[PDB]
Swiss-Prot record, chain B:
This is Spike protein S1. Changing S29F: In strain: Omicron/BA.1, Omicron/BA.2, Omicron/BA.2.12.1, Omicron/BA.2.75, Omicron/BA.4, Omicron/BA.5, Omicron/BQ.1.1, Omicron/XBB.1.5, Omicron/EG.5.1. It comes from Severe acute respiratory syndrome coronavirus 2 (2019-nCoV). It comes from the Viruses. Changing L22I: In strain: Omicron/XBB.1.5, Omicron/EG.5.1. Attaches the virion to the cell membrane by interacting with host receptor, initiating the infection. The major receptor is host ACE2. When S2/S2' has been cleaved, binding to the receptor triggers direct fusion at the cell membrane. When S2/S2' has not been cleaved, binding to the receptor results in internalization of the virus by endocytosis using host TFRC and GRM2 and leading to fusion of the virion membrane with the host endosomal membrane. Alternatively, may use NRP1/NRP2 and integrin as entry receptors. The gene is S. Binds to host ACE2. RBD also interacts with the N-linked glycan on 'Asn-90' of ACE2. Cleavage of S generates a polybasic C-terminal sequence on S1 that binds to host Neuropilin-1 (NRP1) and Neuropilin-2 (NRP2) receptors. Interacts with host integrin alpha-5/beta-1 (ITGA5:ITGB1) and with ACE2 in complex with integrin alpha-5/beta-1 (ITGA5:ITGB1). May interact via cytoplasmic c-terminus with M protein. May interact (via N-terminus) with host bilirubin and biliverdin, thereby preventing antibody binding to the SARS-CoV-2 spike NTD via an allosteric mechanism.
């Protein structure tokens, strides 16, 4: 009841999973060498070639 | 028009300009554009030009 920080394993697993998912969704905004990082605008501002 | 070493500048904003009536004109030696398809020019908003 009094002392915390005894359940480290479960908390670490949850933190690792959340970190992996969060960085995966973070990777969505990177330029990756294109001119813009959004599909809709780059489709609505250019021609197919 | 002034000389090349004193090329004239002007700023343009707060307009409603249609480029279709300007694109189709044949009085131009060349009308080539970089990174913007001319036919879609009517469906954009610019901070300034």
């Amino acid at each position: 009841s009094s002392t915390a920080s005894a359940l480290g394993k479960l908390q670490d697993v949850v933190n690792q999973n959340a970190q992996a998912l969060n960085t995966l969704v973070k990777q969505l905004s990177s330029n990756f060498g294109a001119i813009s990082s959004v599909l809709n605008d780059i489709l609505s501002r250019l021609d197919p070639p | 028009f002034a000389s090349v070493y004193a090329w004239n500048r002007k700023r343009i904003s707060n307009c409603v300009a249609d480029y279709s009536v300007l694109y189709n004109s044949a009085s131009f030696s060349t009308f080539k554009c970089y990174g913007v398809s001319p036919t879609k020019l009517n469906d954009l908003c610019f901070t300034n030009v």
